[PDB]
Amino acid sequence: SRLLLNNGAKMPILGLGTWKSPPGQVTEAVKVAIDVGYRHIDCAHVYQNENEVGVAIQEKLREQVVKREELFIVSKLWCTYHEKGLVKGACQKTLSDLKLDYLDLYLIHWPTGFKPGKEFFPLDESGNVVPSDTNILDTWAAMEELVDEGLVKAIGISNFNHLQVEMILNKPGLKYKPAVNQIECHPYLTQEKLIQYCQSKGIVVTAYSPLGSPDRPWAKPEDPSLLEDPRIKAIAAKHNKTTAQVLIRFPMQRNLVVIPKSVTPERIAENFKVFDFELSSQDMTTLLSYNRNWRVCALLSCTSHKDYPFHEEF
Ligand SMILES: NC(=O)c1ccc[n+]([C@@H]2O[C@H](COP(=O)([O-])OP(=O)(O)OC[C@H]3O[C@@H](n4cnc5c(N)ncnc54)[C@H](OP(=O)(O)O)[C@@H]3O)[C@@H](O)[C@H]2O)c1
Questions:
Q1: Which of the residues bear the PTM Phosphoserine?
Q2: What is the rounded distance in angstroms from the CA atom of residue 52 to the CA atom of residue 310?
Q3: CA angle 92, 41, 79 (to 5 degrees)
Q4: How far is the CA of 220 from the centre of ligand 1 (A)?
Q5: CATH number (domain holding residue 57)
Q6: 281 — phi, psi (to 5°)?
Q7: Residue 172 burial (CB < 10 Å; 0-12/13-18/19+)?
Q8: Which atom belonging to ligand 1 lies closest to the Cα atom of 263?
Q9: Residue 77 host element (H or E)
Q10: Is 244 annotated as a binding residue?
Q11: What residues are annotated to the active site?
């Protein structure tokens, strides 16, 4: 139910995601998740709902349903705060909203830095995203000093390709290794090379968008659906489970942490019932064979950023 991180701490293999969780529904969603047994919540400043997540975490701590040490709370540093001087301030804002005094894990959300300001995606007059001239190594040094300050227990990365991870691992004077690389992963984008790489380096991998992110704002307008894939429905029927429960169990058997998002009380409960069954090795191989290198999250407005992660093979 928990994986060991390089800092000695143990991270719950199942967590609740909160991207697209409306402020008016996420407090209830998080309260319900904690009642159901969830101990790991995935957050981010850019989701614009950390205040409302924090209300839920506070209510459950006050009720003594959980101790703080039992909870594993994750947030992420947005691209407009990559400058060395802004990193502490971004972290502190998140800590306020969440009403916590430390984070368990703090991630660099994307390797790309943007111009600092009030817009999450600052645009020029041609409407292109304005980059910062910062680099990955300077932002990492700022994250390291968050640990020395006691603001966060562990630091990691998100959406880094293997060369970008390499770059941090080879940093002269590297003090804290990345604990976690959080990346998109499901049967259509299986990530076998990047997962072999990080796992060889002792970096834990967290699978985001495990259900294919059916609610992502962008179109595909209609088209491909994991929850509705008839081959994946077959594997679920055979186990008397739902296809969502199969999609969540899949990354767990590859030793990944997984963070399905739901604001629906019955689905939050359904998504928790994945510890009591086992996919066969035949099932696992079959699901891996469905890979079609299809990304939900390609950050398409930054495709010419100097640090865009998805031009490399893995
Ligand atoms: N680091 C990154 O760049 C990054 C990027 C994307 C996502 N993430 C993290 O990963 C989390 C999960 O990814 P995601 O939000 O893209 O989507 P997801 O977890 O793949 O799917 C979310 C959608 O699936 C639905 N759903 C949940 N359980 C279901 C079930 N049992 N049966 C049928 N439908 C179900 C949800 O509906 P309802 O909510 O209506 O129930 C929601 O519409 C995010 O919230 C975020 O925390 C991180």
A1: 1
A2: 33
A3: 45
A4: 16
A5: 3.20.20.100
A6: -70, -35
A7: exposed
A8: 39
A9: strand 72-77
A10: yes
A11: 47
CA 203 to chain CA mean position, Å: 14
Spacing, Cα 17 to ligand 1 middle (Å): 6
Cα separation, 46 vs 42, in Å, equals 12
**Does the C-beta of 78 come closer than 6 Å to ligand 1?**
no
Task: Domain count for the chain, please give it.
Answer: 1
227 lines ligand 1 (CB under 6 A): yes
Instruction: Give me the sheet containing 72-77, strands edge to edge.
Output: 16-17, 40-42, 72-77, 103-108, 152-158, 180-184, 204-208, 257-258
**Domain range for 127:** 1-314
In this structure, which amino acid lies at residue 251? P
- In contact, 29 and 263? CB cutoff 8 Å: yes
How was this structure determined? It was done by X-ray
CB 210 within 8 A of CB 251: yes
Residue 182 counted as an annotated binding residue: no
Instruction: Map tokens 């998100």 to a residue.
Output: 158
